[PDB]
Amino acid sequence: AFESTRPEELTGFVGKHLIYTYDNGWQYEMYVKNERTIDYRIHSGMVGGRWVRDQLVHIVRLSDDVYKISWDEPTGTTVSVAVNLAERRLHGVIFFPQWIAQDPKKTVCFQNDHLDEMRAYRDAGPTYPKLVIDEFATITFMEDCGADDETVIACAPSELPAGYAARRN
Amino acid sequence: AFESTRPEELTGFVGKHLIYTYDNGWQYEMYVKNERTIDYRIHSGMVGGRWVRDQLVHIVRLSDDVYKISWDEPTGTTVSVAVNLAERRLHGVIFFPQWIAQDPKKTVCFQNDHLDEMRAYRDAGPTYPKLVIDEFATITFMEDCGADDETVIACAPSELPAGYAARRN
Numbered sequence: 336a337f338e339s340t341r342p343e344e345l346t347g348f349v350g351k352h353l354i355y356t357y358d359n360g361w362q363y364e365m366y367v368k369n370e371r372t373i374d375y376r377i378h379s380g381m382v383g384g385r386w387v388r389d390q391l392v393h394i395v396r397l398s399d400d401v402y403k404i405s406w407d408e409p410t411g412t413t414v415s416v417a418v419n420l421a422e423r424r425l426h427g428v429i430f431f432p433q434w435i436a437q438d439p440k441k442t443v444c445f446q447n448d449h450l451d452e453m454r455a456y457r458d459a460g461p462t463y464p465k466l467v468i469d470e471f472a473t474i475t476f477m478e479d480c481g482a483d484d485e486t487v488i489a490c491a492p493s494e495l496p497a498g499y500a501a502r503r504n
Numbered sequence: 505a506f507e508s509t510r511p512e513e514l515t516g517f518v519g520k521h522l523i524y525t526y527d528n529g530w531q532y533e534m535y536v537k538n539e540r541t542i543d544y545r546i547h548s549g550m551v552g553g554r555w556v557r558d559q560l561v562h563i564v565r566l567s568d569d570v571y572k573i574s575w576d577e578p579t580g581t582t583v584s585v586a587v588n589l590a591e592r593r594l595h596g597v598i599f600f601p602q603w604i605a606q607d608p609k610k611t612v613c614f615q616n617d618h619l620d621e622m623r624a625y626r627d628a629g630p631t632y633p634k635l636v637i638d639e640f641a642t643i644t645f646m647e648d649c650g651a652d653d654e655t656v657i658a659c660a661p662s663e664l665p666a667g668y669a670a671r672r673n
Binding site for chain 1: 505506507508527528562564566567569570572574576580582584586588590591593595597599626627631632633634636638639640
């Protein structure tokens with residue numbers, strides 16, 4: 336299931352830590368913690384407040400500048416993001432089960448301690464139709480943190496220092 | 505929902521028709537028929553035989569060489585494919601509902617003649633867990649067919665001239 340993960344192709348991407356705002360105004364944050372893991376943190380929008388550690392991901396090189404990250408969520412959400420490092424742009428496709436569209440705050444939590452709850456909401460549905468978000472984002476802040484830094488994403492977005500998510504480079 | 509579709513950015517990609525083989529040996533074919541539509545045809549693998557016309561897609565430009573096509577299927581399957589034209593490399597992530605994994609032949613048809621049946625199988629489930637296929641592919645054949653050529657993918661894989669899927673360029 337992870338035969339596609341090729342670490343020699345990902346050396347320019349593993350360790351990236353990016354804060355980005357989709358064109359719909361939703362502000363997100365991702366840490367590429369290693370070849371098959373991300374942590375992430377949502378700052379604003381439909382599921383603002385949500386954060387996730389140790390999300391297993393498929394990370395692949397599409398070009399020297401462009402990397403993709405895809406994954407399955409215990410909520411039933413499926414996601415594929417692409418990051419263009421040279422142009423400081425991200426693109427997301429997110430396929431949300433209809434239950435999340437109807438009551439997105441149900442997913443707003445530190446998900447790692449609510450996995451049965453997410454699977455319960457997911458099992459109850461509705462599943463269909465998916466709410467499909469297909470959106471470009473601007474990468475406002477990007478830095479290299481190296482691999483396996485447990486400190487990058489280790490608190491809820493409400494508990495960060497004033498100005499954290501607004502920092503740019 | 506199609507805000508991200510920007511035809512002016514896709515002129516180098518719309519019209520492409522590619523045959524590709526994933527790393528697991530499954531041989532696929534896609535025609536980018538216009539800015540928001542693909543036809544596709546599956547030659548081998550778990551759902552060899554299956555073909556689809558007029559699939560609504562989200563097509564975006566990630567770089568001058570890299571494009572992304574993402575979609576939601578009436579079976580509940582969600583997909584995101586990326587194509588690097590310069591490298592003749594494709595990558596796909598496919599999230600199949602569990603019911604397809606259990607009996608994939610149920611989806612092996614000209615789907616457009618079986619839409620109610622696909623919605624019925626999708627609604628009965630099971631949905632979870634997804635079977636997630638994440639794989640590179642070799643683009644073995646690529647050509648430019650222009651937009652809205654209704655002849656590129658219009659018959660089953662078994663109704664093509666001998667050697668069609670084996671052609672190389």
